[PDB]
Symmetry: D3
C-alpha cells in the first residue's frame, strides 16, 4: 500500500513496537507473540502482527537514524491507522551513575538534527513522549521489579561524531542515554497527532555477560508489552 510498506490497512494493529533491527523485530514476534504473521518485507524491514495475552499487537523494525524511522512512523499512522508507537532499543550512557542494563524511559528527547527546526519555524520544539504511555511504562516496570529511569534522551545524527566535547555537555545537562531516533519519532507523532514513547537499555557506557544483556533486553520488551495492556484499561 506504500512505497516502503507492502501491506494493507488492517494488517497492523493499532499499536506497534519498533526496534531498530529488523532481525530484532522477528525475534520479538517469535518470542512474545502468538500466531505472529509476517506483514512486511520490503527493503528487508520485517514487520509482524500477532497477539500478546489475547491483545493484537504489531512489531516492525525502523532502521537507524531519524530519517529512517520518520518514514516508517509517518506511514503507519497515516496509512495504517496506527495510534500508539513504542520504540524499544538500546542506548549509550554518559552519566556515571547510569549503569549497564539500566532501563531508561525517554520522557523527552534532545537532538542535533534539524528536523524539528524545519517543522517549528526554527524555534525550540520540545520533543516529548505521551504522558500516559510514560506512566504506564513506569508502572509496568515497577510490577516487574525494575526501576526505570525517566528523563531526557539524546537523539544523534552522527554515531561517529566529530564533536567529542558534546558528551561533556550531555553529561552536564543530565542526559540519560544516547540514541538516534527518539526526537524524530516524537516529532512525527506531534505532527500527525499520534502517541509515542521510547524505551532503551543501556547497551554501553560512553565512559557484562551475554546472558545478562539478553535478560534485560527481554525485560524491556515485557515492560513495553505490559504497559500497553495497562493503557487499554
Amino acid at each position: 500500500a506504500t512505497p516502503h510498506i507492502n501491506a494493507e490497512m488492517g494488517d497492523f494493529a493499532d499499536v506497534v513496537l519498533m526496534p531498530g533491527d529488523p532481525l530484532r523485530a522477528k525475534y520479538i514476534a517469535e518470542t512474545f507473540l502468538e500466531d505472529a504473521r509476517e506483514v512486511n518485507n520490503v527493503r528487508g524491514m520485517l514487520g509482524f502482527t500477532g497477539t500478546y495475552k489475547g491483545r493484537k499487537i504489531s512489531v516492525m523494525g525502523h532502521g537507524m537514524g531519524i530519517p529512517s524511522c520518520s518514514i516508517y512512523t509517518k506511514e503507519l499512522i497515516t496509512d495504517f491507522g496506527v495510534k500508539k508507537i513504542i520504540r524499544v532499543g538500546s542506548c549509550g550512557a554518559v552519566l556515571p551513575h547510569v549503569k549497564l542494563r539500566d532501563v531508561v524511559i525517554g520522557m523527552g528527547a534532545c537532538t542535533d538534527s534539524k528536523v524539528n527546526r524545519i517543522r517549528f519555524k526554527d524555534h525550540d520544539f520540545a520533543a516529548i513522549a505521551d504522558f500516559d504511555m510514560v506512566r504506564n511504562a513506569v508502572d509496568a516496570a515497577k510490577a516487574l521489579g525494575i526501576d526505570a529511569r525517566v528523563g531526557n534522551l539524546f537523539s544523534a545524527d552522527l554515531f561517529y561524531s566529530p564533536d567529542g566535547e558534546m558528551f561533556d555537555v550531555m553529561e552536564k545537562y543530565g542526559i540519560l542515554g544516547v540514541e538516534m531516533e527518539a526526537a524524530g519519532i516524537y516529532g512525527v507523532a506531534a505532527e500527525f497527532g499520534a502517541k509515542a514513547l521510547t524505551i532503551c537499555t543501556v547497551s554501553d557506557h560512553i565512559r557484562t555477560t551475554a546472558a545478562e544483556r539478553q535478560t534485560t533486553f527481554n525485560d524491556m520488551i515485557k515492560i513495553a508489552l505490559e504497559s500497553v495492556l495497562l493503557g487499554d484499561k
Copy 2:
C-alpha cells in the same frame, strides 16, 4: 544573601512555589500558609516561608520572562539549597478544545528564546519537567476532582509577537498553552541539578479572543494552588 535575594541560608524551604506576580505570593502565604513569615522584599519581589499541614514551604514571585525567572531560580538553587521549584501561573490557549479556566501541566516547554541554545551548543535541548513532580500534580488534581491536561507549553519571549503565524504552528503541534517562563526554569533546573514543574490555568483564548472573569480566575487560581501544595505532600511519601 544574594544580589537579588535579601535572605540567608535556611530562610527558604527545600521546595518553593513561584507565581509571576509578587502580589500573588502574599495572597498565597496569607491564604494557604500557616505561621508564615516574610523572607524577602528586594525589588518588591516578596517572598515568604510557612507551613502547610506541618510541611515547610516557601513562596515567592519570579517576575515576567525567562531572564527574570532565571535569576531567581538560579539563586534559590545555588545559594538557598532549594530542591524543587513549582511555577504557578496563567497561560493563553491556542487549542480549540482547551477551555478557559482549564488546568495545564507542562511536561515540556517549547520556546523562541535563545537561552537553551546557548547552553546546548546550539542544538535542540528538550526543556522538560521532573517526571515525579508531574505525576504527583496529576494525582493531586484527580483527588480534587480536577482534570488537568499534560503536555507541551510554549514559553515566549515576546508577549506582543510580531509573528502571528506562529500561533497556527503551535496549534498544529498541539501546544497546550502559551506563557513566558517554563522553558527557562527547566533549563536552569537541568543546569543546576534541581527539579521543576510548571502548572498553569487557562487565562484566555489566544484564538477566539475570549478572556476569563475575575471571579472564575480567583476560584480556578485557588484550585491550582491547592493542586501544587497537595502535590508536594504526595512527593514526600
Copy 3:
C-alpha cells in the same frame, strides 16, 4: 487600561523614565518630582506622574530582562501615547578603563537575545537609540560636570551566563557595559516608532570582580537621574 497597566490615557506624560526596580521609581518620584501622583501598581510595578521644572514627566519600573521591559514599553507607546522612553539603570563593566560609578550612554546595544532576529527576518538589526536623545544626555552630563561615555552596551538574557568566554569578546569589541534591557527597548521603539535611550551607572566590574558601595551608588544614582531629567528639558528646546 492594559493587561499590565491599570491606568487611562493621559495618566502618563509623553516621556517616561524607567528604572528596573519599582522601588527606585518611588524614590525618584518622591525626590525629584513635584506634585507627583501614583498611576499604577499592578504586579507591584509602581508608576507615577509629576512635574520637573514645570515639565510633565512620568516614572515607572520595567522589571528585569528584555521580555519584561518589552511588555511595558510596548503598552506605554501604543496605549498611553508615550513618545520618549529613558531607561536608567546599572551595568557591569568589562573594560579595564571603565571605572565604577562611571556613567555610560548606550548609543547602541548588542545582545544574545533572539527578539530582534524574530523581528528582522533573522538578519542583523542594529539596536540603536535616538540620536537627539543621546546628544541631549551628553550635554546635560557635561553641564553637570560629568563625563559620560557613549558607546555600545550588551543586553544579556542570562545574568548567570554559562559562557564566560563571551566576556573576552565583549572586551575585545569595546562594549561599555552589560545589562539586560537596552536592546529590547530599542527594538520595541523601532517597531512602534518611538524614541528611546538608556543611561547606566557602572555598578561593578565584571573583570576585577569589584562592586561599588551603597554610598557611591546612591550618589552616582542621583547624578544619573539628574542627567536624564535635564536631558529632557534640553530636548524640549
Copy 4:
C-alpha cells in the same frame, strides 16, 4: 569486525557499490557478479563480494537517510580499507523535463541536514563527488548509449516534508533529483579522505506523482548498475 559489520579485513573489495535497499544489493550480486559471497548480514544489511569482468567488487546496502549511510560508509573506509564508494539509488524528480527512469549523476549534493554544518563550523560545506569518478561514470554512460544528467542532487532528511514550497526552490535552482544520502556520503568521504560518487534513477515525480513499484526499484534499475560497474573498470585503466 565492526559494530555494524560482521566481516573481516579482506572480505571487502577496494570499491563498493551501495544501494539503499539490501535486497537490491542481493539482486546486483546475483545478477551482475560472478562467484559472489555474502560478507555481511548484521541488521539484515546484506553485503556481498564477487567479481565483475575479472574485477573484484563488493555490494552492500546503506539503509535510508544520512545517519544510516554515514555509519556504514565510515566503517567501510576505516576498517575494511574501502577506497571508493559508489552509491546507486533512486530519487524523485522536480524538473518538468526530467522524465522517469532517467539516470542522474550527483556531482554535488544540497541538503537540509545539519551534519555538514557540525563538521564545518556552521559554514557552507559544498558536498561534492570525486571528479574522476564523475567523469568515469559520464564516459561509461556514453559508451552504453545511455543518457545521463550531471548536476546537483538534494539530500533530504524528511521524505515527508512539511515544507512543500521547498520544491519550488529546488526547481528554480535546477536540482536534478531528491534523495536522502548523497550529502552525507560526500561529507564522510571528505572527512575520512575517500572517494565517492552517487548515481540515481528517477523513481518518481514529486510533481506528477508517477512513482514506480517496490519490486521495480528493487530489481528494475539495471542501467544505472551497468554504468557504475563499467565506470569502475575505466577508473582502473
Copy 5:
C-alpha cells in the same frame, strides 16, 4: 607595503575619506584637495593624499560590498596608521518621507551579512559609528544649511536580492537608506580599535536633474571635510 596597497607608512593621512568608486576618489582629490598626490593604484583602486584648508587628508576608493571595503579598511588602520574613516557614498531610500538628495548619516548599520556574527560568537553585534564623528558631521551639515537625517542604514550583500519582502521589513523598522558597506566598516573599526562613520546621499528611491545630484554630492563631501576640522578642535 601590502598586497592591496602599494604605498608606505606616512603616505596616508590619519584620516581618510572613502567613496566606493575609485574614479570618485580622484574626483574628490582634484576638486577639494590642494597638492593632491596619487598614493595608490593597485587593482585600479586609486588613493590620494592632499590638504584641505591646510589639513592633511586622504581619499581612496573602497570597492563594492562588505568584503571589499573590509580589506582596505583593515589595512589602512593596521599598516598605515589611519585613525578615522569616513565613507561617503550613495544609498537607496525605502521611507516615503525620505527624499532624493537627502543627506543620511549612518549612526548604526543593519546587515544581512554574516561577518559580524563570525566576529561576535553568532550573537547580535550592533554595528555603530563613532559618536563624536556623528555629532561633528551633524554640526558641519547644520553650518552649511543642510538638515541631515541620523539613523540606521542597511548594508546589503545582494544588490540584486531575491527577497523583495525585505524592503517592507526595512521600512517597518525605520531604515534610512540601503547601501552595501557600512556594517562592514563599523565591524572593522570596532575590531581594530579605530573610528568610523558613513554618510550617504539618497541616489534613488526604492519606491532629478544631473546638475542637482552633483550639487548635493559635493555638499556631502564638504560636510565630511568640515566635520574633520571640527573634530580636530
Copy 6:
C-alpha cells in the same frame, strides 16, 4: 547599459573571462586577444572584447568579494546575453602539498557567506561549477602539459579572518584554495541559469606566508589564462 556597465547588447561575447583585478583584464586583453576593444570603464572596472584563435571573447574584472562579483555576473547574464563565465583569479593555499603557482580548478565552492542561505531557505546549497566546463579545463591543462588540481575551494568574506582555527578545518576537509568569490558566482549562475567555472593560481600560502607581489598577480599568471582560453575552444567543438 546597466547601472554598473556602460556597454550595449553585442559588446560582450557569449563567454567572459573574469579576473578580480581590472588591471589583469587589461593585461589579458593586450597579451592574449587580437583587436581587443575597451567595452566598459565604469568604476574603473575594465572590460574588453577581442578575439582568440578566431573566437570572439570578452574579459572583465569583477572586483573583490562575493557582493562585488555578484553584481557584475548578474548584469552580464541578464543584459548582455552572456552564457558562460570563467573566473580566473588567485587563491591562498592551506594544504602542505599545495605549492605556489599551482593551478586549481574549483569544481565546488565552500563559503562563510550568507548569500546562498538567503536563496536556499537557509539550507545547504552546494555551489558547483558546470561539469562540461570543468572537464574542458581539465583536458586543456592536460594538452598544455600543465598540472591542475580539481576540488573544493573556499569563498571567504573576510580576507583577514578572526577565526584562525577555521584554517585547520579547511585543511582537514582538503580544500584546495581560499579565495573570495567562487561560491557567489556559482550561486548567480544557478539562479540565472548560466554556466560558470573558477580557476585559480596559488598566489600565497596561509601556512608558510610565501605571498607573491602585486605586479606578479597582475601579469604573471599566464598558465591559468591559457587553460581558460583553450578550454573555451574545446567547449565550442
